[PDB]
Every structure is written in structure tokens, then in C-alpha cells.
């Protein structure tokens, strides 16, 4: 009926590989931790690497293609990737705190704040995840 | 009809600062790629102030709480916010480019681990087709 989000998707791969992923918001180990950064650097760096390629064939006047931006898409996708898994690793709901986020944003842009405009509590988030 | 999805969300943000973006995958002017790799660093060093935080709690003999994972918690998400935002600004839909990595990540079940715990790929291994992934979006 419908697909998962990309959040149930790390819960799938977390789940077929062995490594934690609690059902409720969970303080994690520091090698745990360790790992997610290790993760974000090595996702970031590709990021980076590829956008540095494009800018350098624009300034050689290439006009890119659609397909041109397949292995920039590939390493932004791998970026949600990891950023998806370590919100799963602490067993916190990635989508429930997103919605927040985009709660708070989107609210900021009908206003310049608008008058009753409440940021992101996340706090709150947590504490309702602890509860379901 | 199915919820929205994080990446229809950062679509919907788009269109609501008037900034409307491609509905196909579109190659982005030199300028934009700049801006874009600027927010992921932002946001990428928020993430690992916060990460770097806990450690140093945590080595200084502290327990954390579910509720001390708040603010690492908002920064992943902010994370995330950008990240999808590159995406949608070049006519890219995130979804179906994360749903063929995630198929190729599945694969890597029977592969060994890192010593750090990363999940490495077994041999025979085959990596995602987002090349076919982009192809299929650009003529759909
Ligand atoms: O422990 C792991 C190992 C890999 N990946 C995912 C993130 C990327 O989508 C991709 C990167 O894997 P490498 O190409 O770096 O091996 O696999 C994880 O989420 N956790």
C-alpha cells in the first residue's frame, strides 16, 4: 500500500546486519557514538568530493547533464543514509523529530518570525517517544 | 492516500518561501552548489559539536540520559533538513534515489565488520544504480 519512509528503511538494514536499534529513546555508548561521527565524516567527504568535481567541469564550461548528477545524488542519499542511522541507533524516531523540525520551519516561513511562532522542541519529542 | 514523505516535506518548504524548485533532475548553476556545500558544513559541524559533547560527558564519567540526546537529536534533523534540500533544489527525488541505495545496503549483510563497527561488503557485492535511478526520474 505504502512504501516505508527512509527511517523504517535503517531499521530494516540495522536489523539485518545485527547492530542496535532500540524501540525507545536510549543513551548509547561512546564506541557508539565513535561510529556514527566516523560515518558522518566519511559521507560528508564524498559530498564534498563530488560537488568539487561538478564546479570544476562548469569551470572548464561543461554543460552538465541530468546523469552528470547521479554520483553527487549517490553520495547526498548515502549522506541521509548515515544521518537516518544514527537517529535509529539511539532508537530515537527520525520522522517524529523531522516533523518537528519542518513543524518549526515551515511555521517561520508564514510570517520575521509570526507572532505565536513556537522552534523546535525537540525535548518534547523525546519525552512523547519514551511513552508512545 | 500514503503520508508525505521528509523529502515531499522539504519540497513543500521550498514552495513556501516562494523559492519553488524543479519537478525533473536539473543540472543547478555554479552558485548554487556553493551555498548548498556551505549549509551541509554547517550543519555536518553541529552535529559533531554535539557528538563531541557526549563523549566528553561520557569520558568525564557522566551517565547520559534519553533527554541529553536532544540537542545531537535537533542536529541530525537540521542535518537531514539541508541535506533533502540539496537534493530537491536539484530536481532530484530523494526517495526513490535513497530506496535503491537501500536496496544495495541490504546486500551487505553477509559482509564482515570493521573494527569500528561499520558493516563492510561481502565479495560479490554490487553497488546501487543511481545513474539508472536518475535516468528513469529525468524521462518518467
Ligand atoms: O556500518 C555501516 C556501513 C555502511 N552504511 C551505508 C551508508 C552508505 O549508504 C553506505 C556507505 O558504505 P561504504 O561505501 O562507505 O562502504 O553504506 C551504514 O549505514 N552503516
Redesign the interface.
Known sequence: ???P???E?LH??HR??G?ATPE?????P????????????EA?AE??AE?DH??AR??AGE????????????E??????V??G??DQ???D??A??????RA??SK??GLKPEGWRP?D??G???RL?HA
Open positions: 500500500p505504502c512504501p519512509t527512509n527511517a528503511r530494516e538494514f539485518a546486519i547492530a525507545r529513546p536510549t543513551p548509547p561512546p564506541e557508539l557514538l565513535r561510529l556514527r561521527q566516523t560515518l558522518l565524516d560528508s559530498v564534498r560537488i561538478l564546479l562548469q569551470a554543460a552538465l547533464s541530468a546523469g552528470d548528477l547521479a554520483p553527487l545524488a549517490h547526498l542519499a548515502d549522506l541521509l543514509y544521518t537516518y544514527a537517529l539511539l532508537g530515537i527520525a520522522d523529530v523531522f516533523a518537528e523540525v519542518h520551519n515551515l516561513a508564514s523546535a525537540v525535548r519529542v523525546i519525552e519514551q
